[PDB]
Amino acid sequence: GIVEQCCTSICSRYQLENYCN
Amino acid sequence: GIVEQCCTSICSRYQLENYCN
Amino acid sequence: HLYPGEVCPGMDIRNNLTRLHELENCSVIEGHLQILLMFKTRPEDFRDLSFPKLIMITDYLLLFRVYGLESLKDLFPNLTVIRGSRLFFNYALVIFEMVHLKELGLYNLMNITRGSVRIEKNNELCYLATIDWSRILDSVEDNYIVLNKDDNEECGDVCPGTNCPATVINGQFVERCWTHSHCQKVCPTICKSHGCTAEGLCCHKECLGNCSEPDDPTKCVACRNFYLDGQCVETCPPPYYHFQDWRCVNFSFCQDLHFKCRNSRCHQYVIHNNKCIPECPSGYTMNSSNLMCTPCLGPCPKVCQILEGEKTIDSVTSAQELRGCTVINGSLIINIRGGNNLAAELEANLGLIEEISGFLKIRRSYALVSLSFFRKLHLIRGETLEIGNYSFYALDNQNLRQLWDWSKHNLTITQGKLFFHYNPKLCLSEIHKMEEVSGTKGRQERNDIALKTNGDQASCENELLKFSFIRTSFDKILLRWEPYWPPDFRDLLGFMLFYKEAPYQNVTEFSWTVVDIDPPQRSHPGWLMRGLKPWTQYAIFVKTLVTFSDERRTYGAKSDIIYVQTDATNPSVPLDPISVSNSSSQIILKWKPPSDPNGNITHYLVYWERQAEDSELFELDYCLKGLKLPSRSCPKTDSQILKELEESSFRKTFEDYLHNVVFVPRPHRPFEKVVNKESLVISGLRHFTGYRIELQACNQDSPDERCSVAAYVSARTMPEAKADDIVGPVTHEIFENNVVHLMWQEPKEPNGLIVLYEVSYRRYGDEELHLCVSRKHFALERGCRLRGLSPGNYSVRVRATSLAGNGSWTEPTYFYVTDY
Amino acid sequence: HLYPGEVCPGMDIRNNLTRLHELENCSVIEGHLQILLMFKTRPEDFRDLSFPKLIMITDYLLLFRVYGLESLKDLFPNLTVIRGSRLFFNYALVIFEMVHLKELGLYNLMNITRGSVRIEKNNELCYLATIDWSRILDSVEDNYIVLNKDDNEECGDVCPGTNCPATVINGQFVERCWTHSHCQKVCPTICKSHGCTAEGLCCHKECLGNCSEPDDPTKCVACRNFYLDGQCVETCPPPYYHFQDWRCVNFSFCQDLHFKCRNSRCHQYVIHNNKCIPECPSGYTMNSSNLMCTPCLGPCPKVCQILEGEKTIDSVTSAQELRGCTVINGSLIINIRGGNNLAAELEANLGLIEEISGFLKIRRSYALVSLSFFRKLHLIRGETLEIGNYSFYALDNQNLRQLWDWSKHNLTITQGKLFFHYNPKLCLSEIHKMEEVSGTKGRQERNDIALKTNGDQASCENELLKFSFIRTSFDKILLRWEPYWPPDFRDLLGFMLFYKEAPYQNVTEFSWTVVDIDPPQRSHPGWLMRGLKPWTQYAIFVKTLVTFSDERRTYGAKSDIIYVQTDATNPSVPLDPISVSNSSSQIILKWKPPSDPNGNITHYLVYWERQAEDSELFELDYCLKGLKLPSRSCPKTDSQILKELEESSFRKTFEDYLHNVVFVPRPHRPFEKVVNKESLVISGLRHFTGYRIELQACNQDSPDERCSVAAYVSARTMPEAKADDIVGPVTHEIFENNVVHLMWQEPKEPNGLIVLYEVSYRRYGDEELHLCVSRKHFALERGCRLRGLSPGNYSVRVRATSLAGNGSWTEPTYFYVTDY
Amino acid sequence: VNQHLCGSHLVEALYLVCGERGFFYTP
Amino acid sequence: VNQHLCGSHLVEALYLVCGERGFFYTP
Known part of the structure; x- marks a missing residue:
């Protein structure tokens, strides 16, 4: 899910549009 | 030595003459 | 009355209210409703929008960050039932981070069949403590309502009292109101769950929540068991089959659903046991023409292909995905970071699985007390092992006591090693019993099962110490127990004696004052008790102190808790002895029982003696001027203990080294007796006589008095009328x-x-x-x-x-x- | 004088005294003497047997279970030196289980060069505390004298005082005597170790213990450094070589010993550095004709073939068997079950080894504080590994703080994994530094290095918290520190604040009152202190409380200990105010300083006022009869902390689950001033007059007085003799x-x-x-x-x-x- | 700006990143 | 009689077993 990608790892800008329309 | 034979294991009669003349 | 309109299978609403308009034409939701992620909204966007048609929700209701919504009393003015067929993390009603909301307003919610309610992070929410959740939820202890305006602040809660019923919650009565103008409707105790009308009459037997006319199945707003053609039926009559545990449908509907699923992208429905269920259980298979699942001529289980072969179970909803499974083609990770026991629902959802193709891991399960919810777990093949080649991983379980009931439960592990760590209430005996029963005795290596962490907080010495001589005295109790010696008698460093006063028999195991007794010399070890309070029952048991051996079993010896009561003695002096004169011949004496009864106070002793008037006053010339006659700690840290262990082990090490080196293997006064009274009336008293009162509290009468010194007080009667008057002619x-x-x-x-x-x-x-x-x-x-x-x-x-x-x-x- | 007779290399006596008669013809023992296992003997068997020739023992003396021997004053009346070249479990004099012995009687033992004395399990031994071991042993803290008659009972100790010198041992002087008729001979402080004569004169510089004539090398009984032809020397002159560190011999003797060993079954002696040593060190090899070991033309180390390839080191004598080794063809197990630091001798014996062909294991070493005694340890090949394929096993070391000094020490491990467990004072930072330096970074797997046991008793948060605002008041101190947030800010559960009175600056780390502070909301966190004692210096530091993560590094943050002193205020009222009137015009006032100075008491204030006589007495007719004129707290622990941890983790788990499910990744009066005095003399007083005294203890004089209420006391002066006398003619x-x-x-x-x-x-x-x-x-x-x-x-x-x-x-x- | 996003901060980060188009959910 | 011999009990057991011949020690 999103939490293991962001809260544990380091989130860049690109993938956050994968959670948006 | 004698202690690992007797205090840890179980000592019977026979070997105790190995510690005697 | 009953449910009109559509059925509107559960939907999700996001990012705007444009799609929210599709809830107008249905009264019952056959699914879950989620209103969440609503940022660009204002409080004026919700007043004009209302959904009075909605009655009951099958699965759950979730509200998460909907800006501008201040109360649900407008959105859902007729919501009364949440069945909770499918939960959301063992919760049926979740309100999380719902900013800009002040009150719930769900004043018609009566019964939530399954699940709990979690309300969290609502800085502006009030009217929470004014709701009696016990009338809605069967188990209110499973709720979680924290971080709101009620505990952060002191926002007003004005429940109209002049009408809102009040019920005690802990020890006081408080009025119940959903809002400032709506009281929580409470039914009489006779109406268990069928609901009550306006005047307080029980509805139909198969009714629930609310009804229009009492004792009328067709005038109810929520059928308790099943719905059919506007009538509640205990079971669906033929040819109607139970569907979704809430309504009955004909064969045509189930067949249509099956065909629609088959001819498209699913829940391919079948029929079994007079029900239209998504899939029939193990040992059955659907036929071509009809949809009924006939029993199969062989052992075909219902395998449940777990995605990624590793499924974490942390909630009721996650466990429910394995409902009806018998063989798991993957691995299970049981991890409930809870605080409340979920074994009841977990045994209902799980426990029907026979084999686990992978590994079983239980990690950080705080609330678990036993793994007995695996009712029919027999085989753990372990074709896929945990890192380190493990097939059973138990770690950091704070309350795991028993793994299984080995009297009647069998287990088999094909491959993989074992692992146990930081289970403070799981003892090594259970682990070794599991080793023997499973068949993996010669498969574990060192440190796979720890010794200082498993059972370090549980007393399971599995060896009995028997007391041999106990004698009781006034304040000393002499204890004697049979001597105990481990195989290496130098390991016994002494005994610990735990004593504590026990008013009643039922006392726990493992206050508890500790005293250390040195080991005996090789005369029973024994110990004598000092400083005890007379007539008190104490709990005594002894647990041995032995040196740890890293290789083999640590060691074990302890005594069962015994109860000894010290005898009685003389009681204490009565407190507050006060004598008051109410008449020239009557005085009242008041006192209380002593603070140290030392048994049962049986009676009292009162002694009388008159104070003769001072002869000094008889021999004074009071006519002279100046005639003003009176108008009558814990053990010093760990260092301490450690040091003693280290010294004893050093002595043993030197002894062993010396033995190794040396030996070579060649090749009277008036009185009375009070009976259970704290006051006494005195008669026959001379006017103006100093009376010195000797009062005793005495607890033994016939076999000699055993009671302490007396209290002393003085009293004088009131003046008479004509005692001072001079009689006789002058x-x-x-x-x-x-x-x-x-x-x-x-x-x-x-x-x-x-x-x-x-x-x-x-x-x-x-x-x-x-x-x-x-x-x-x-x-x-x-x-x-x-x-x-x-x-x-x-x-x-x-x-x-x-x-x-x-x-x-x-x-x-x-x-x-x-x-x- | 010097040593006559034979040399009698160390022997062992067992089971009888028949073979004991071979000690008559020698004065010095070039080895160890053991008298042990003597059951069939009686006390009359030792009186007739004496050995006055014996002077010194090179290695050690051991007495173990010799029946009938009551005192050694008859057996060894001239034993004075125990060199301790070879010890017996880091002990030079052992007396163990020596039944039927009352007193030592070794009244001529002066110096024990190396080792300690252990005396244990002698139920009848007395005259132990009457010996000043500090005059014999360089390090007396290494002794072990327990389980004797002195502590079990109170046997008499009669040291002749009328002569036995007395020296303070802890805080009192006690006489020193070996027996009831022998005082312990004590030399003056000028005579460091050369000894003194009967009259108290220092002996020769090369002397030790005792001498016949002061300042005479040839009249001594124990050469301090070396012995040669009846003379003590600094070093052996040529052609004499140092032999056995106690005497000098010629080339013929060393050659004869070498030939005798070569032509028989051994210590094949060689010659190196003007010494006849058993074997020359690495890089040298003995020649054919002469015995000198010339340097070798290559790197040839001194390999030490360890029997069974696994040697346990638990004593100085066991470590001494590796003296001079450089390459070990086996495995080492370091296990000192002690309590005293052996690093000094262990670094001398060990530390010259370069490579270890096997594994290095440190297990249950209580006294070890560092592994720095391996001065030149570089390579651990690990060709033979510990069970579980380990090459470095550290377990249950109670005081291991640092492994090595990584600034200048290199290490290399070829094969084998790592292991660390239950090292409460060894932190994960050192372990990871060792991983990086050694080169085994990608070789360990999970649980090989524990996280809850390594460093759990040591503060190594390796992150600094900085205070930002501290302000001091009368009894309140306001603290403010910069906020800290871990990567997962929900992990921060709050702060713990530790405060304690610090009279002097040097305070330890890790009393210590604790207060829990909730984390801030996302305004510095801060905290205010209540109930402080004025004018006191406190030690303040903050250490964070964060949730454990099992996978990666736990976390770390803490503040250095700071010192803040609260200000001063008004002091307390003086205690014990008493005024005495010795004379008719003199009164002395005495008082105690206040119990709460609240700073430095600088001065006192005393106020005077005369009490006017009552006007009632002036207006009474005392001639009437009746004229009798007066003649003027521990946290609920587990049942508490855990619960909070579990609740916080449950909240975080629900948040994570919700985020996972929701988001989808689409593809005025007279007075004075006292100056540092506690008494005052007052004059100018009316005769027989009562005065009211107002006394103050005041700590601020010029910048306004800041001092509390005054103590009140009454003093009446003595009356004059002729004040009442009537003057004037009648x-x-x-x-x-x-x-x-x-x-x-x-x-x-x-x-x-x-x-x-x-x-x-x-x-x-x-x-x-x-x-x-x-x-x-x-x-x-x-x-x-x-x-x-x-x-x-x-x-x-x-x-x-x-x-x-x-x-x-x-x-x-x-x-x-x-x-x- | 690259850092760890947890708790409500994750929701805020997504809301700044997008919200003119709206979040996605499977049909 | 077969059991664990430790401490002084070992010495007593050896003395009971032998001692008319005496203990052994290498020359």
């Missing part, structure tokens, strides 16, 4: 030379004693003259003697003064002396 | 009708006031008549007036009564009245 004498000598009878029985007499003689027309007559003066002169009086007729008045005060005057007496 | 008046009116001047300045006057008139030959004159009587009648006196000559005497007491009579005054 006699006067006149000699040849005009000497006046008076005679008056004294008050023979006065208030204690008479201090003086006063004679007031006044000649007719003259002034009144006073003379003091003292006790010695009265004794010597036998009354009053006057010297040198002017001729005339005087008036003689006499009064007597006592310890009470001023006495009444005597009648006037007239005498005339000659003028010569 | 004047009498006789009227026509014989009326006597007396006139005497009153004592105008009396002791306070005069209550009455007495006139005593006696006619010549008659009796003395008394009359009382009161204050009002004197004011009205201007003295004494008498009515109706019989004619004659009377004598008038007058006295005045004051509050102090009775005044003296006046001179007689004679008056005569007419008889008509």
Whole structure:
């Protein structure tokens, strides 16, 4: 899910549009 | 030595003459 | 009445209210409703929008960050039932981070069949404590309502009292109201769950929540068991089959659903046991023409292909995905970071699985007390192992006590090693029993099963210490127990004795004052107790202290808890002894039982003795000026203990080294008896007598009194009416030379004693003259003697003064002396 | 004098005294002497046997279970030196289980060069505490004298005092005596180790213990450094080589020993560095003709083939077997079950080894603080690994803090994994540094290095918290520190604040009152302290509380200990205020300093005021009868903390689950001032006058007084002797009708006031008549007036009564009245 | 700006990143 | 009689077993 990608790892800008329309 | 034979294991009669003349 | 309109299978609403308009045409939701992620909204966007048609939600309701919504009393004014067929993390109603909301307003919610309610992170939410959740949820202890405005602040909660019913929640009655204008509707105790009408009458037997007319199935708003053609039926009559546990449908509907799923992208429905279920259980298979699943001619289980072969179970909803499974083609990770026992639902959802193709791991399960919810777990193939080649991983379980009931439960592990760590309430005996039963005895290596962490907080010494001699005394108890010796007797470093007063028999195991007893010399070890409170029951048991051996079993020996009561003794002195006089012959004495009864106080002793009046007062000349007569820690850290372990181990090590090097293997007074009273009335008392009261609290009467010293107090009766009054006519004498000598009878029985007499003689027309007559003066002169009086007729008045005060005057007496 | 007779290489005596007669012909033992296992003996078997020739023992003396021996004063009356070249479990004198012995009797033992003394399990041994071991052993803390008659019982210890010198051991002086007739010989502090003669003169520099003639090398009984031809020398002159570190021998003796070992079954001696040593070190090899070991033309180390390839090191004697080794062809197990630091000798014996072919294991080493004694340890090949394929096993080391000094120490591990467990004072940072330096970073798997056991008792958060705002007040200190947030800010559960009074700056790390502070909301976190004692310095530091993560590094943050002192305030009231009036004009006032100085008491304030006499006493008629004038807390622990951890983790888990499910990735009065005094003398006081004293303890004088209320006490001065005496001649008046009116001047300045006057008139030959004159009587009648006196000559005497007491009579005054 | 996003901060980060188009959910 | 011999009990057991011949020690 999103939490293991962001809260544990380091989130860049690109993938956050994968959670948006 | 004698202690690992007797205090840890179980000592019977026979070997105790190995510690005697 | 019943449900009109569509059925609207569960939907999700996001990012705007444009799609929210599709809830107008249905009254029942056959799914879950989620309103969440609504940022660009204002409070004026919700007042005009309302959904009065909605009645009941099958799965759950979730609200998460919907800006502008202040109360649900407008959105859902007719929501009454949440079945909770499918939960959301073991919760049926979740309201999370719902900013800009002040009150719930769900004033028609009556029953939530399954699940709990979690309300969290609502800084503006009030009217929470004014809701009696016990009338809605079967188990209210499973709720979680924290971080709101009620505990952060003190926002007002104005429940209309002048009407809102009040029910005690912990120890006080508080009114119940959903909003400032809506009281929580409460039904009488006779109406268990069928609901009550406006006037307080139970509805139909198969009704729930609310009804229009009592005792009418067709006038209910929520069928308790099943719905069919506007009527609640206990079971669906043929040819109608139970569907979704809430309604009955015909064969055509189930067949249509099956065909729609088959001819498209699913829940390919079948029929079994007079129900239209998504899939029939193990041992059944659907036929071609009809949809019924006939029993199969072989053992075909319902395998459940777990995605990624590793499924984490942390909630009721996650466990429910394995409902009906018998063989798991993956791995299970049981991880409930909870605090409340979920074993009831977990055994219902799980426990029907027979084999696990992978590994079983239980990690950080705080609330678990046993793994018994795996009712039919037999085989763990372990074709896929945990990192490190493990097939059973138990770690950091704070309350795991028993793994299984080995009397009747069998287990088999094909491959993989074992692992156990930081299970403070799981003992090594259970682990070794599992090793023997499973068949993996010769498969574990060192440190795969820890020794200082498993059971380090549980007493499972599995060896009995038997007391041999116990004797009781006034405040000392002598203890003796049979000696115990481990195979290496130098390992026994002593005993620990735990004692604690036990008012009642049922006491826990593992306060608890500790005393250390040195090991005996090789005479039972024993120990004597000092400083005990008499007549008290104490709990005694002894647990051995032995040196750890890293290789083999640590060791074990302890004694069962025994109860000993010290005997009785003399009680304490009664407290607050006060004596009050209410009459000239009656005094009331009040006291309380002593603070140290030391048994049962059986009676009291009261002793009387009169204080004789001081002879000093009888022999004073009070006529002289100045006649103002009175108007009557824990063991020093760990270092300490450690140091003793280290010293003992060093001594043993030196002994072993010496033995290794040396030996070479060649090749009387008035009284009474009170009976269960704290006060007594006294009679037969002389007026103005100092009475010294000796009061005792005594707990043994016939076999000699065993009771302590007495309390002392003094009392004096009230003054009488005419005790000080002088009786007898006054006699006067006149000699040849005009000497006046008076005679008056004294008050023979006065208030204690008479201090003086006063004679007031006044000649007719003259002034009144006073003379003091003292006790010695009265004794010597036998009354009053006057010297040198002017001729005339005087008036003689006499009064007597006592310890009470001023006495009444005597009648006037007239005498005339000659003028010569 | 020096050593005569044979050399008798160390022997062992067992089972009888038949072979014990071989010690008669030698004075020095070049080895170890053991007297042990002697059961069939009686106390009469030792009196006739004595060995006065024995002087010193090179290695050690061991006595173990010799029956019948009651004192060694007969067996060894001349033993004075135990060199301790080879010890017995880091002990040079062992007396174990020596039944039937009462006293040592070794009254000539002066110096034990190397080792310690262990005396244990002697139920009858006395005269132990009467020995000053500090004069014999360089390090007395390494001794072990327990389980004897001195502590089990109270056996008498009669040291002859009338001669035995006394020296303080802890805080008191006690006489020193070996037996009831032998005092421990003590040398003056000038004689460090060379010993003293009978009269107390230092012996020769090369002397030790005892000597016959001071400053004479050839008249000594124990050479301190070396022995040669009856003379002690700094070093052996050529061609004599040092042998066995105690004597010098010629080339012939060393060659003979080498040949005897070569041509028989061993210590094949060689010669190196002007010494005859058993084997020359690495890089040298003995030649054919001569015995000298010349340097080798290559790197040839001294390999030490360890039997069974696994050697346990638990004592100095076990480590000494590796002396001079450089490459170990086996495995080492370091296991010192001690309590005393052996690093000093362990670094001398070990530390010269370069490579270890096997594994290195440190297990249950309580006393070890560092592994730095491996001075030149570089390579651990690990060709033979510990069970579980390990090459470095550290387990249950109670005080291991640092592994090596990584700034200058290199290490290399070829094969094998790592292991670390239950090292409470070894932190994960050191372990990871060792991983990086060694080169085994990608070789360990999970649980090989624990996280909850390594460093769990040491503060190594390796992150600094900085205070930003501290302000001090009367009893409140306001603290502020910069906020800290871990990567997952929900992990931060709050802060713990540790404060404690610190009288001096040097305070330890890790009393210590704890207060829990909630994390801030996302304004510095901060905290305010309540209930502080004014003028006190406190030690303050903050250490964070964060949730454990099992996978990666836990977390770390703490603040260095800071020191803040609260300011001063008003001090307390002085205690024990007592005033004594020694003289009629002098009063001494004594008091104690206040119990709460709240700073430095700088001065005192004393206030004076006179108490005016009561006007009631001036207006009383004391001549009336009745004239008796006065003659002036531990946290609920588990059942608490855990619960909070579990609740926080449950909240975080629900948040994570919700985020996972929701988001989808689409593809004025007199006074004075005292200066540092606790007493004051006061003069200028009216005689017999009561004063009210107002005393203050005040700590601020010039910048306004800041000091509390005053203590009140009353002091009355002594009365003068002649203050009550009546002054002035007595004047009498006789009227026509014989009326006597007396006139005497009153004592105008009396002791306070005069209550009455007495006139005593006696006619010549008659009796003395008394009359009382009161204050009002004197004011009205201007003295004494008498009515109706019989004619004659009377004598008038007058006295005045004051509050102090009775005044003296006046001179007689004679008056005569007419008889008509 | 690259850092760890957890808790409500993750929701805020997504809301700044997108929200003119709206979040996505499977049909 | 077969059991664990430790401490002084070992010495007593050896003395009971032998001691008329005496203990052994290498020359």
